[model samples]
Target: HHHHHHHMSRMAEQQLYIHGKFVAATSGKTFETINPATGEVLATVQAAGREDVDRAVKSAQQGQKVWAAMSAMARSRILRKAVDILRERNDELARLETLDTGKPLSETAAVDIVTGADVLEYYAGLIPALEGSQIPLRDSSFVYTRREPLGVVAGIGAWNYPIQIALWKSAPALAAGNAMIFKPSEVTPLTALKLAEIYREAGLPDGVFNVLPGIGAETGQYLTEHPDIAKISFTGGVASGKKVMANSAASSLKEVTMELGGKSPLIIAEDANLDLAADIAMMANFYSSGQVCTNGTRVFVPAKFKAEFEHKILERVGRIRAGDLFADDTNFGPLVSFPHRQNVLRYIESGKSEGARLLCGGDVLKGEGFDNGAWVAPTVFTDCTDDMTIVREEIFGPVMSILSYDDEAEVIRRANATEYGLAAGVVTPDLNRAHRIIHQLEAGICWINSWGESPAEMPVGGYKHSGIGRENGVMTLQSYTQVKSIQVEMGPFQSIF
Candidate 1:
């Protein structure tokens, strides 16, 4: 079963999408994307550099004018059709995603693919409703505002959720009548390329959506520095986002929307249900192998109930099975690559060396099938302090750190202490306390009694180092457009000189 899936992915298309056609890079260079599960090359994709980015920007400039000229209804119809095509090819894309990124097939199918399609459909529905407004003027002058599309926008996606993040950026950009040039993570570009093909099949005009699969330094930096690219919607690490911001200023001063890293905290109040909190905490930290930026890695528990919460969490973590991505009942999968797996393991070592107690799962799984795979077990650390390295940084793997707090105010302060303010969760039976804690938390997205519940219409972003601008929801659509206010004289105009 594993070999068959690997072979199938190896046969997938490995090309750049330029002007709505699959073609080789102008430099004739390619990079190998590997299956993180088996450490085998899945496909060799075209490596786009500055020259290719230049071509894509030119193509996008021409395409944006045509796409913007279309009626809102016409554009909506095309985007809706793209959603239909996404649904039609769900299974293929899901499997390819699993093969590429080593995430569970169930997650890729249920969450990633479903949410991606929903984003496209949601933005499509909003097309007709996306309009400017008129204003009243006192001096017999007509004034109104028009939201105009930025000519060409770039979408740089992260490796964790390739298709979802790409669509999350593309759907709104396209629905707002702008052309997009997408750069999916070089390690997980297969499904994104497949999406480009689906968009073309759905009758999207040529060059409206282009995909460039290449390394970040060459391809991504080029896009950020390009003079014609109007806006950049990015999702990745903080360091890379900072570079994108700096590069944006170097040339055209392009608008940038960043969704970056997180060290999100989840608070368990004294009145919380221990069982429910444990389950939610387990899923929050372990899902997608903890590759998510918004995963609640820091769990703050009331000091009196910390023991009970830790016991229940350990019980649940014991049942989490890490293995092949296609396994029917596997709860965890490999990290994105061997290097990333090692990076996570180093953090675990740091947790131990820094005096945090490793309650469970701090060893690398080694055996015949796991030898080449990038696998890390679900690790839990108790007796944690806010100053600990594991508690302060994003492990980006299945590692959880538990901290004890005496009062609500203390927990809130500790949770808000991190530089990252992407997301936070509060589990409490008391609605009043939940609301109070929610108000105090600095995260952009807060969960009252739930964790990791992101709807298509829900706006997602960070407050601090987490991100700069919001993604999803109407705010995303608004980001793709620039506002223009016009004033017309009804009678003779008076000069103020």
Candidate 2:
């Protein structure tokens, strides 16, 4: 049955998606998924516990064989069809995304929903092209390798970019013929449930895709520690990523892939275009209300261009309006939750107390519609030092920290000083300098004269403490699939003693 988007409540009735079925949790525990825009309870969703996870994993083990045994061509068709199904439900998808995430409808429709579908399509294209190479030796008879699935894997997704992160992990994992039991962030589960429905409707076999919705400590910990799980693909904070790594080890030695948070830097070179550079800086810092993990929060500007760049950024940011989620004129909406709102506000306080000059917004917006919502203005801090907490930590909010740099080498060294190496950007008119910066920067994904330029074909992971493996590249399927070396005799085995 095709699902329709009705504003009216489905009313105390959402459940866990396990083995292609929506069922109540074993503990009958339920949690409220509040609308971030209104701070009101949207739905009561099943909180999957240990027993529920066990059932899901067992079913996934059975389904893994059925899925991996199928021809790649058939799997490709189902994944391709899933993309179409999502497109058909685009309106509902975008609405749910805006409601749960507290992002503007316009932004969600254009970027999140669009990218969510495109990622699946990209992986579907790779299904047929996936291959393993042959190893030839001087006296080798027949030596080849097989790229095989890891059976039942698990995905623990972050709240921000809920749908995109879910599909980013699921598409590659499923395309490699592995069954995935995904645990969407407790704060965001409505869209995940819808994604499972789309996958089932697109003809994915039972247990191939599951959605377990609950808090990270319970559902996330149990899912990662489950002995039957082969791998854990995660995207979230450094703290959560560490716990995931430890839990995966304490149980089975499960392969783990993660994209942890980063305090990324965007270098504004001396000879750059200040107009375009300022716009790109805001795009880096303020988009999605600045909850993005790879956001260029630490913007390093040369002394010559700092004043010009700062003025331009202030001019544009001053005009940005935060209003209703569905309002067409609203530049952005609210933070994901009240707790998150408080967290971001605390960082703002740190910036002020640590001697950083607050150029603009740094407080919660309280008026009519904003009073009840988790709203924070797009904030900017200038005269920042490397030692400041705002400069070093990943605030994960609409907070931008501006610092001054003297020379090229100094800026490069400062950029690479942090433990995070997820993404870094340099905005300069000179292409030669851009290449030099890109080469020197330690991040896994680097942008030249741009910020947040993400495409489905380009693979992005992290370096240092940021992440372990890459996602969305041509070779991504290989990560999910283990290799098996096959050696056969040319004729029969002849032993010369």
Candidate 3:
């Protein structure tokens, strides 16, 4: 067990970003985003009001005139400048991310910063790559298409990956010449605000990128449903995404992009390598305390290897070291807060009550080191049915449910049974079987012999409850713009009589 201790130095904190300035809440109401490891108030942040959201959107609307009219190269230059600033402040950002979200500093430094910056760099490169198609006509006419930005886009980022997800949504929108506003979750808004500061320093226009740090029900609802916004991008639970969709429909018919909840699955065939399968499966569900939407929550193992697979899985998953946030050797950190820890605990209880076998660790993790922290060890459950709440719902924690399948057909049936089709994985040495299962599984992304290994360039999205559209990759860039065709009579041009 490890306790949350403030070993690192704490610099002065600024908590809000609006119109390229750091400011307090307009209503003067302040809330704190606490560090879960020690239950310490990291920073006192201003809770943005509906008026703040409106102002942010209005700023973006005004900024769009200047930003959208700029050349692609100019846009890229500004984004590159932001990326450089992030690189210069990498350590600070990583520390702030860890302090705000309770993830390991190493992960924040290595994975989060690298991935977040890659998005900016990727979009920077894509500036020159933007193109449209020319249509060939039978008559003496010329036709070509143009891609235009969706003006004044809004983003609602989830708490689990605050900075990373915000960049995921806003980077492309900005790179494609759209002025945007981001509403970070109230639970973790420090990093978003800090990033906004860097964006301002990087020469972004005052209204080009604005952040409203507040609760979802009020600010989030108003921003999503606001008639002035032309598009909305959100990342969070399925229920919340549904609300966003409804809100978008209520007023302006705003274009929407969502990466919602995922009850993702991992399939293990009898012919697979048990060692590799178990390792990947445990990592899939245990990494980031299993808060990722792409975590493999449900596992379908072949009937012949079910018992052995479960045993090996328990052996691997049991070794997970769960504790405080700053423990250098600790494998997992505390949940975002006490409420989230309680949520996972209740779900674990539900699993046990619903007859799912507690195969491994279960219970609120308590230790002298974690006396004042919110910590839960990795958990696994077998003897679970597809209809159970634990299996159907998105726990968004380190809870793995094991299900046995008779064959490839049964595995596919069970895997596809859920409403989610975000991503799924298959582990088998047989290449043909892997390909077959990959094709049969109806998901936006399918992995072979691995799990939760999403690359930055690969398009990521879902089929059903998972999401509305894809993000990243070439197709994602294309999806962010609207195409329009311009036709002209080129040869012997004359008005019709």
Return the candidate ranking by TM-score, descending: 1, 2, 3
Residues 207-305, model 3: lDDT tens digits = 888988777887788788788898888898878888888878888887898998788889888888888989889878988878888888888877788
Question: Could you give candidate 1's per-residue lDDT for residues 346-444 as a string of tens digits?
Answer: 999999999999999897778866777898888999999999999999999999999999998799889999889999999999979989889989999
Model 3: lDDT of residue 299: 87
Of candidate 1, the 10-residue stretch with the lowest lDDT total is: 1-10
Residue 468 C-alpha lDDT in model 1: 87
Error of 3 at 65 (Å): 2.2
The clash number for model 3 is 0
TM per prediction: 0.97, 0.96, 0.94
Candidates 1 and 3: which is better by TM-score? 1
- Report residue 395 deviation for candidate 3 (angstroms): 0.6
lDDT of each: 0.89, 0.89, 0.82
**RMSD per model, one decimal:** 1.8, 3.5, 2.3
**Whole-model lDDT, candidate 2?**
0.89
After superposing candidate 2, which stretches have Cα over 4 Å from the reference? 1-10, 138-140, 491-497
Best by TM-score: 1
